[PDB]
DNA sequence: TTACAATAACAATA
DNA sequence: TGATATTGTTATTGTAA
DNA sequence: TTACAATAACAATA
DNA sequence: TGATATTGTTATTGTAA
């Protein structure tokens, strides 16, 4: 197995950081680069274990959550420099107890949400705003609108989504499009990786598609296209965050602040409300439209966040 | 740690089998008894490993599912004879691959059900039959009726359920009772073990309660009360199975045969349809009424089996 | 002696 | 069933001034 | 040379 | 996150006959 290599992306990041004139020092990326370098020429498992142990020692005061993320960064770096068969991958791991606890925390949060759904009282207004965004000349605005209307993830919409018209007999679907470019997935059976699949839309599909090509043909849309996730975050995350804060500050439910992924939650809640066939559970429908693996009903649980006021009324009406 | 002991329940079962005049020979219980006996005086892990390995060798041609169950029987026997701290418990285990595969199979089945819910067209009739059973003089019939009306498990209803009236301000709830005696659970936080908790009922609570005391005061109801699960199965399972087959043969959906647990599925579907408050998900509501652990939304997935025809209609009515 | 924008760390969610 | 890829939030850095 | 009831094995589900 | 407790189905046994 390779006893030498470099994590190219990390060092490119550091080298780009060499010319900043503002901002935090890239301490973490640095530690990761040093780590990978020190690893060069290492052959003994106890040496590897020692090195990792020092790294884990440094991460001490961080949040459990932060530590899991960081561990992912180191593991991806090792994997990039030395490949998949490097014994350090058996060693640079988190404790099972830590992963287990993260899971417990998460499921508890979700359970808490399921017993106290937030009533999205002004959701029609939110969707209206998103429809209006589809006509803006600012491609960020169009992007947001497309989030609301298609429920695609921001990274998907801005960097890789392929929206297409969807058939319906001999005609074209008014309320559904074809989508390719599912993120957070990898090649496999039952996976939507590189799969084109049909998704409902919350305004006319023509409108959506037109707004999309306008996004893709713009200047900023040309930068965005095919970008990596790190690049995407750096270029757009804070601006998108702020714009969304502002756009929905008045209409969003009081229980939470307006965030981009909010739109993906609402979308699922709205599409189910409007389009769900009768022989299918809410879990199944959500998993279907959100691009989840074939037999995964559990990720859908994360998205049951809101109650639409019509349903709140109707349920209250008994008795 | 104890190097000696006996699995009393197993040998009592064998000794009761000594006087049968009909039926299969208790091969399995026998092998388990011999196993436990051979274990007496054992001190060396390789000897233990060998013994287990022979047992696992015998179980070869059985179904994965059967093998997991059998392994539970051996483990419970070891645990009963020698206690919880016996090193054989580290050895008499199934493979991780086997448990993982069982899980995959299960989730796939559930996923398949969620994308093809069975329309329970005649469910009003089924519930009616169950209401009628509450007036029968045959306590089995009453029991069935109470399954349909309370969604409690058969073992719970026949052997240990404690039904009680539920308050509602200064009055008494018309559509909910108090229940104690949750099975398939053990002492813990967030658990319903020995907890009295409120559950909806699908006919008037008075009716339900009256039918219950009639069940409890009967002769067969006196046998049933406080019985073990093995005793319960042996005494009642095949008769209950047959009676249920017969009672619902004409009205049950064509996609499946009428089984007692069917009534627990339908119950949950009906109660949600009628009683579910607006700020709660179907998963949460099911987990609440079915007695599931506090942060467990996943077991609820097993119960989404049917679509009530009203919902099928209403969903079909768009567009 | 503060503003401010820019950056990556830190952190949560799916 | 081993341990990721997105989204979301804040402390630090450098610079005008 | 079969019926039949009884039993526990075998098996799936939650 | 280690490995159970219920519910559901069928093959074997013994007995009349
Ligand atoms: C823990 C966890 C893992 N995963 C995936 C990412 C990897 O495939 C693997 C890592 O754990 O599981 C999720 O998608 N969500 C989660 O909450
Ligand atoms: C695999 C599995 C386990 N369990 C419980 C029983 C034990 O507490 C433990 C055994 O695995 O998990 C279930 O309730 N359902 C399942 O499907």
Author numbering:
A (entry chain A), B (entry chain A): 103 to 421
Could you give the paper's own sentences about this structure?
Hairpin telomeres of bacterial linear chromosomes are generated by a DNA cutting–rejoining enzyme protelomerase. Protelomerase resolves a concatenated dimer of chromosomes as the last step of chromosome replication, converting a palindromic DNA sequence at the junctions between chromosomes into covalently closed hairpins. The protelomerase enzymes function as a dimer, making staggered cleavages of both strands of DNA to form covalent 3′-phosphotyrosine linkages, then exchanging the released 5′-ends while holding onto the 3′-ends, and finally sealing the broken DNA strands to generate two hairpin ends. The TelA monomer consists of two structural domains, the catalytic domain and an α-helical bundle domain, that together clamp down the DNA substrate.
